[PDB]
C-alpha cells in the first residue's frame, strides 16, 4: 500500500512549517547580538571551555544543529567570512525572515515558484538601486571614510570605545601592507597581519608593531636577545646532525675508518652553519629544528637563531624584509654558496617582555614596512573576542580600499529598499507582486532589531525612519534624506552622512544575494524523507 521505506516520511505543510521554525530557532539566537546595542553570548562546551563571542560566524560554527534547514543558515554564516568578513549576523536574520514571510504566502495557496521568481525580481532590483544611490567614493572623505567605517564594525563588539584608538590602528595596518599586482590592482592582503594575544594591561596598551611580531622564543639562553642592524636569514631545513636516508647505509669493513664517519656527521653539519654565518647574518629563522650541537655556533659568534617557526610566518617575514626562502643548496652545481646578496634586512630584532612569555619583534623590516598588532586584554576570554573583532575590522577597510564605495549603515539601506520595492511591485506586478511586497517587509527586520536591543520605541522609531525615506523618493526637491538612519543612544532618526556611520557596499550587496539564494533552497522542501541512522547494522 504505502511506501515501504524504513525511515520516516512527512509531506504537506508539516515540513513547510518546520523549516521556518528551524530558521527562526537560529535567528532568535543571533537577534540579541546585532548593532551597537548588541550583547555578547557565552559558548560553554562539554569539556569546560568557555567562548565569549558575538560574531554570527563563531557562534553558529560551534553550535550543534540537527535539522537540514538549520545547516543551510549555519553554512551561510561561514561563507560571509571568506567573501566579505563582517556581514555575518545580518545575513542570518534576513534569510530567516525571507522564509517567514514566504511561509505566509504559501499558506494563502500561492505557488512557491512565483515567490522564488518574485524574490529574484526584488533581489536584482535591490542591487540596482544601491549602486545608483551611493553618496561618494574615497576621494572626497579621504581618511575620514576609513576611520568611520572601522568604528561601525567595532560598535557591536568589545572594542567599541568612544575614542579612535582601535580605529587608527586598523587603518594604519591596512595602509602599510599595500601590495600591488598586475594590471593596476592595489591588493590589501589582511591575512598577513599577525594578530597576537597576551593577558596583560588594558585595551589602551595594544601595541602597533610596525614590522612583524614573531611568536617564538630564542631557545638557548646564551644568545644576544637584541640585535641592532640585523640581517635576517630565512631558511627551511632542520639544523640537526647529518642523518643518512633509507637508501644509504654505513657498512664498514675496516675498524680504522669507523671514527672518521662518526665525525663526518657533524663536520658536514657545521660546514653549512659556518657559510651562512660568515656573510654577516645575525638572525636565523628555521621552520625545521636546530639541535643542541648547532646552538653553540650562534652563542660563540654572537648570532640569534630562532627554531621551529611557522611556515605561514616565514613567508610574511621574507616578503617584508627582502629575504629569500632557501630550502637547500643551489646555484648551478655549487658546493656551498648560499647567495649571500639575498639576505634579509631589519632595523632591530628585540625580544621584549610580554607578561611572562617571550616574543620576538622585527622593526620596520627595511624593505616593505609591514605591520603586526599585539592585543592586550584582561583574560583569555577577552583576547579571543578582541582577535575576532579585530579580524572583522580588518575586512571592512579592505573592501573599502579595494571597492571605493560605501553605503550608510544603521538601517539606512533597508529603509530605502523597503519603499522603492513597494513602488517597484506596483508597476510590473501581476501575480508576483506579493513576493516583492514581502521582500520589503523582510528587509525591515534589520532596523527593527536595532530598536529591540536598544529597548527603544519599536513601531514608532522605524515608522519615523521610513517617513524620511518616503519623502526622499516621491518629493524630488533635493531633500537628501537617503542617509537617514537610527541613533540608538538617543532614539531618534539621524543623518548617517555627518554622524560617520559608514558600511561597505558589498557588506549589503553580498548579504542580499546570499540570503535570497539561501531562501530559495529552503522554500523547496515540500516533501522530506528522513532515513533511520545506520550505525550498528
Amino acid at each position: 500500500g504505502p511506501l515501504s521505506v524504513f525511515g520516516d516520511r512527512s509531506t504537506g505543510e508539516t515540513i513547510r512549517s518546520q523549516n521556518v521554525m528551524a530558521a527562526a530557532s537560529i535567528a532568535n539566537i543571533v537577534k540579541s547580538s546585532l548593532g551597537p546595542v548588541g550583547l555578547d553570548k557565552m559558548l560553554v562546551d562539554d569539556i569546560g571551555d568557555v567562548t565569549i563571542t558575538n560574531d554570527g560566524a563563531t557562534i553558529l560554527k560551534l553550535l550543534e544543529v540537527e535539522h537540514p534547514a538549520a545547516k543551510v543558515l549555519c553554512e551561510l554564516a561561514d561563507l560571509q567570512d571568506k567573501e566579505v568578513g563582517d556581514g555575518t549576523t545580518s545575513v542570518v536574520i534576513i534569510a530567516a525572515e525571507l522564509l517567514k514571510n514566504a511561509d505566509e504566502l504559501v499558506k494563502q495557496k500561492i505557488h512557491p515558484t512565483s515567490v522564488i521568481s518574485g524574490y529574484r525580481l526584488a533581489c536584482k532590483e535591490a542591487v540596482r538601486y544601491i549602486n545608483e544611490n551611493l553618496i561618494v567614493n574615497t576621494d572626497e572623505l579621504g581618511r575620514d571614510c576609513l576611520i568611520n567605517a572601522a568604528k561601525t564594525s567595532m560598535s557591536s563588539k568589545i572594542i567599541g570605545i568612544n575614542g579612535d584608538f582601535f580605529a587608527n590602528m586598523v587603518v594604519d595596518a591596512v595602509l602599510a601592507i599595500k601590495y600591488t599586482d598586475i594590471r593596476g590592482q592595489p591588493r590589501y592582503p589582511v591575512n598577513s597581519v599577525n594578530i597576537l594575544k597576551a593577558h596583560g594591561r588594558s585595551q589602551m596598551e595594544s601595541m602597533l608593531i610596525s614590522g612583524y611580531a614573531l611568536n617564538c622564543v630564542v631557545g638557548s639562553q646564551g644568545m644576544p636577545k637584541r640585535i641592532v642592524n640585523a640581517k635576517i636569514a630565512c631558511l627551511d631545513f632542520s639544523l640537526q646532525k647529518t642523518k643518512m636516508k633509507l637508501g644509504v647505509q654505513v657498512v664498514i669493513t675496516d675498524p680504522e675508518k669507523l671514527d672518521q664517519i662518526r665525525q663526518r656527521e657533524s663536520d658536514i653539519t657545521k660546514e653549512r652553519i659556518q657559510k651562512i654565518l660568515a656573510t654577516g647574518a645575525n638572525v636565523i629563522l628555521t621552520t625545521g629544528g636546530i639541535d643542541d650541537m648547532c646552538l653553540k655556533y650562534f652563542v660563540e659568534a654572537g648570532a640569534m637563531a630562532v627554531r621551529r617557526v611557522l611556515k605561514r610566518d616565514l613567508k610574511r617575514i621574507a616578503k617584508a624584509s627582502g629575504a629569500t626562502i632557501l630550502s637547500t643548496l643551489a646555484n648551478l652545481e655549487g658546493e656551498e654558496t648560499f647567495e649571500a646578496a639575498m639576505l634579509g634586512q631589519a632595523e632591530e630584532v628585540v625580544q621584549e617582555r610580554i607578561c611572562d612569555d617571550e616574543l620576538i619583534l622585527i622593526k620596520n623590516t627595511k624593505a616593505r614596512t609591514s605591520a603586526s598588532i599585539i592585543l592586550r586584554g584582561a583574560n583569555d576570554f577577552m583576547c579571543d573576542e578582541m582577535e575576532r573583532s579585530l579580524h572583522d575590522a580588518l575586512c571592512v577597510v579592505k573592501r573599502v580600499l579595494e571597492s571605493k564605495s560605501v553605503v550608510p549603515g544603521g538601517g539606512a539601506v533597508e529603509a530605502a529598499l523597503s519603499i522603492y520595492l513597494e513602488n517597484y511591485a506596483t508597476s510590473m506586478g501581476s501575480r508576483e507582486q506579493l513576493a516583492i511586497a514581502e521582500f520589503a517587509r523582510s528587509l525591515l527586520v534589520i532596523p527593527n532589531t536595532l530598536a529591540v536591543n536598544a529597548a527603544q520605541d519599536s513601531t514608532d522609531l522605524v515608522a519615523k525612519l521610513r517617513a524620511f525615506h518616503n519623502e526622499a523618493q516621491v518629493n524630488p526637491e533635493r531633500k537628501n534624506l537617503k542617509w537617514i538612519g537610527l541613533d540608538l543612544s538617543n532614539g531618534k532618526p539621524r543623518d548617517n552622512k555627518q554622524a560617520g556611520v559608514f558600511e561597505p557596499t558589498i557588506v549589503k550587496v553580498k548579504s542580499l544575494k546570499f540570503a535570497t539564494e539561501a531562501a530559495i533552497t529552503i522554500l523547496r522542501i515540500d516533501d522530506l524523507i528522513k532515513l533511520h541512522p545506520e550505525s550498528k547494522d
Binding site: 546595542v37 540537527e66 568612544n162 588594558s202 607578561c355 584582561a378 583569555d380 576570554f381 541512522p533
Partner: protein, 146 residues
C-alpha cells in the same frame, strides 16, 4: 524507537535577566571567598589538592587556582587573578574584590531599565580618569638608595 524531531539537541538556552543578574552573583561569590585575605590581619586558608597535597596559604592567586568551578562567569574571575599574578607580584586579591564591587554597583543600574552599554561607556570614561589621578599623587623613588 523513533527519534524526536528536535533542534540543537542536549544543549541549554538562557537569556534575559537570569544571565545579567546571574553573572553578578557568581562574581560576588568568589569575592566573598578571599575577602578575609587582604589586610595585614588576614588568616591562612588550608586547601586540599586532588594529588593528595595540602596548600596552606593566604595569597589570593594560590587560593583561586585550587578551586574548580562549574559556572562560566566564575571561570572568568580565576583567569583575572592569573593575569595579575604574571604581570605584578602582589596584585591578586585586590582585583577580585574590586571587580566584584564594580559589578555589585552595576547590578543596581541593570534593574533601572538601563542598557549595559551605557554602564560600560561610563566605566571606560571612569577608567581613563583613574589612571590620571594616580600619576598626580605619585612620588619619584631613588633606586640607588638601599
Amino acid at each position: 524507537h523513533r527519534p524526536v524531531l528536535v533542534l540543537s539537541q542536549n544543549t541549554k538556552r538562557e537569556s534575559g535577566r537570569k544571565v545579567q543578574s546571574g553573572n553578578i552573583n557568581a562574581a560576588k561569590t568568589i569575592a566573598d571567598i578571599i575577602r578575609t585575605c587582604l589586610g595585614p590581619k588576614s588568616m591562612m586558608k588550608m586547601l586540599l589538592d586532588p594529588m593528595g597535597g595540602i596548600v596552606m596559604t593566604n595569597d589570593g592567586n594560590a587560593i583561586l587556582r585550587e578551586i574548580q568551578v562549574q559556572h562560566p562567569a566564575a571561570k572568568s574571575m580565576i583567569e583575572i587573578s592569573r593575569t595579575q599574578d604574571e604581570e605584578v607580584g602582589d596584585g591578586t586579591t585586590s582585583v577580585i574584590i574590586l571587580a566584584g564591587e564594580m559589578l555589585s554597583v552595576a547590578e543596581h543600574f541593570l534593574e533601572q531599565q538601563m542598557h549595559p552599554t551605557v554602564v560600560i561607556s561610563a566605566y571606560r570614561k571612569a577608567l581613563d580618569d583613574m589612571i590620571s589621578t594616580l600619576k598626580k599623587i605619585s612620588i619619584p623613588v631613588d633606586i640607588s638608595d638601599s
